[PDB]
Amino acid sequence: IVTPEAISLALENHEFKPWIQPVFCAQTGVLTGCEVLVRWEHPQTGIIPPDQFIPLAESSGLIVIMTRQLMKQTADILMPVKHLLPDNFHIGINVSAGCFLAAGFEKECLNLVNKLGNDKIKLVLELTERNPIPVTPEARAIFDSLHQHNITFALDDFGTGYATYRYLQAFPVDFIKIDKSFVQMASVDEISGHIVDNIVELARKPGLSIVAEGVETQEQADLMIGKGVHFLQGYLYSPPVPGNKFISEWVMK
Amino acid sequence: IVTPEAISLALENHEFKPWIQPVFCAQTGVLTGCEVLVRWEHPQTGIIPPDQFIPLAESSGLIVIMTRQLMKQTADILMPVKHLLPDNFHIGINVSAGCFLAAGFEKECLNLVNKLGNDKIKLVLELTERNPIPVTPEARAIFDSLHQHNITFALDDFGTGYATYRYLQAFPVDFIKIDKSFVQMASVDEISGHIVDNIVELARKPGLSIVAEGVETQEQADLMIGKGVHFLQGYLYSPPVPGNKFISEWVMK
Ligand SMILES: OC[C@H]1CC[C@H](O)CC1
Ligand SMILES: OC[C@H]1CC[C@H](O)CC1
Ligand SMILES: [Mg+2]
Ligand SMILES: [Mg+2]
Numbered sequence: 177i178v179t180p181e182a183i184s185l186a187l188e189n190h191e192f193k194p195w196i197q198p199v200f201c202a203q204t205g206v207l208t209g210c211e212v213l214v215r216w217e218h219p220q221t222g223i224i225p226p227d228q229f230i231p232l233a234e235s236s237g238l239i240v241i242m243t244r245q246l247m248k249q250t251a252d253i254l255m256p257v258k259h260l261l262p263d264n265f266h267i268g269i270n271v272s273a274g275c276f277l278a279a280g281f282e283k284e285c286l287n288l289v290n291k292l293g294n295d296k297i298k299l300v301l302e303l304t305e306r307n308p309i310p311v312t313p314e315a316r317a318i319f320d321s322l323h324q325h326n327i328t329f330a331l332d333d334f335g336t337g338y339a340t341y342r343y344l345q346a347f348p349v350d351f352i353k354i355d356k357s358f359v360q361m362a363s364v365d366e367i368s369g370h371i372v373d374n375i376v377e378l379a380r381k382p383g384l385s386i387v388a389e390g391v392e393t394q395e396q397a398d399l400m401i402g403k404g405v406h407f408l409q410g411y412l413y414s415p416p417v418p419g420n421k422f423i424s425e426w427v428m429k
Numbered sequence: 430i431v432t433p434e435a436i437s438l439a440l441e442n443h444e445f446k447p448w449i450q451p452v453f454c455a456q457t458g459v460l461t462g463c464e465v466l467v468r469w470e471h472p473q474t475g476i477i478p479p480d481q482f483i484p485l486a487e488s489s490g491l492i493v494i495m496t497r498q499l500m501k502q503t504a505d506i507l508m509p510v511k512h513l514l515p516d517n518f519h520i521g522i523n524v525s526a527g528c529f530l531a532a533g534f535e536k537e538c539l540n541l542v543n544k545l546g547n548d549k550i551k552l553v554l555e556l557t558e559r560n561p562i563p564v565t566p567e568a569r570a571i572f573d574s575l576h577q578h579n580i581t582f583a584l585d586d587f588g589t590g591y592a593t594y595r596y597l598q599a600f601p602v603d604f605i606k607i608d609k610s611f612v613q614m615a616s617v618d619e620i621s622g623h624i625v626d627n628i629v630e631l632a633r634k635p636g637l638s639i640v641a642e643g644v645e646t647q648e649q650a651d652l653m654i655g656k657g658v659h660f661l662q663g664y665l666y667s668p669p670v671p672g673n674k675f676i677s678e679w680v681m682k
Binding site for chain 2: 334335336337338339340341342344345348355357358361365366367368370371373374375377378381382
């Protein structure tokens with residue numbers, strides 16, 4: 177029984193942990209960044225997956241607290257090893273409208289960047305497709321302010337939900353992440369491949385970088401690489417893993 | 430002011446009228462079809478525009494009645510002149526998920542087509558961006574059934590709302606209508622033109638046709654024509670007009 181009070185208690189007890197999935201250069205296979213995903217480790221019941229708590233976190237507003245804690249915990253995890261990270265190491269944080277609009281959001285982003293090195297790392301706010309940022313002047317002001325501070329944006333799960341051409345028109349973002357439904361169907365159906373080409377063409381004029389999500393097989397990767405995708409992410413390389421294991425597997429060694 | 434009961438009463442009092450906007454071949458300027466739009470003429474106070482009633486029509490469910498009436502009235506309006514219509518004359522009807530999934534929908538579409546000539550006209554169900562059809566087997570069955578009956582589909586206001594690549598992947602539609610926000614901004618801003626190019630490239634592989642909406646100036650039209658758009662629609666040619674005036678201006682002369 178997942179309730180707002182159970183989520184609040186779990187936040188106090190720091191049960192929401194940052195699992196980290198590596199991301200790679202499509203050209204060379206080299207580690208270029210990561211995405212931070214949340215896992216609720218309930219001390220008795222075990223893993224409660226995002227599907228069961230994120231929606232309620234969002235409607236209750238608790239998501240703001242959760243995201244703040246994940247950002248803070250990500251800084252703590254990576255700080256001891258920040259000198260071992262490649263240059264321009266990307267850190268992907270999933271951001272909903274509620275977090276984006278919350279007083280003090282910009283400050284939390286700066287704290288993460290300052291702790292880890294203003295110029296060593298690149299913070300990528302991965303804007304969700306489900307609870308899009310509204311298209312308003314105020315939203316654009318926050319967006320522009322963060323950009324002036326060298327923080328960057330992705331449209332996440334592009335091609336699904338509210339992740340439309342309109343968002344690219346309203347917000348000059350830096351990355352587009354292709355939803356896995358297109359990546360994984362591009363070798364199977366008649367349009368999914370064409371959709372990936374379309375996203376590649378879309379990115380080219382403004383000079384955005386593309387990441388293919390959900391890369392599961394080598395043929396999917398080769399296909400994505402061949403179509404001009406810049407970064408790759410998925411279970412072929414690694415699923416998301418706990419922080420200590422992310423450090424141990426992908427940073428050390 | 431505007432309530433579900435006022436909408437119900439207005440339906441019974443026939444205050445919702447089908448206005449009709451012509452659509453044209455971009456290459457030649459020739460009449461190829463129309464879109465059926467709704468206007469609420471309140472007897473004392475005047476027009477209540479779609480923006481103020483459609484949402485409440487949709488959430489209340491009354492949209493199903495309204496759309497049914499509009500389809501029926503469009504048949505009545507065009508029947509006397511159907512022999513004067515060009516071959517393959519397109520009739521665009523705006524359809525939300527609620528209408529599409531309602532009992533009796535397919536039947537209403539057939540009645541329209543049979544009254545007007547199975548092979549003279551082409552019914553185009555313009556799927557809305559606000560209230561997308563769910564991506565389910567049952568939805569796809571209704572979609573396929575209608576296709577077998579030579580009824581066609583458009584993704585309306587493509588690039589906005591939920592009108593994403595995913596809808597093209599889930600439903601093999603026949604047309605894409607480009608939202609006016611791209612048509613009218615193409616050559617004011619830095620990406621809108623690029624977005625139209627992208628929609629043109631998107632359509633080409635599966636062989637879909639494109640209509641540019643909101644064509645307001647000659648330079649917008651020339652631009653859309655140059656980029657390979659197939660059909661044009663907007664105030665430059667004509668706003669929507671009452672049926673009798675549609676017939677008198679665009680059919681019977
Ligand atoms: O390392 C490439 C990065 C691109 C942006 C993404 O949001 C994170 C991974
Ligand atoms: O006349 C071309 C037609 C294209 C489909 C649209 O939904 C109606 C107009
Ligand atoms: Mg993400
Ligand atoms: Mg329409």
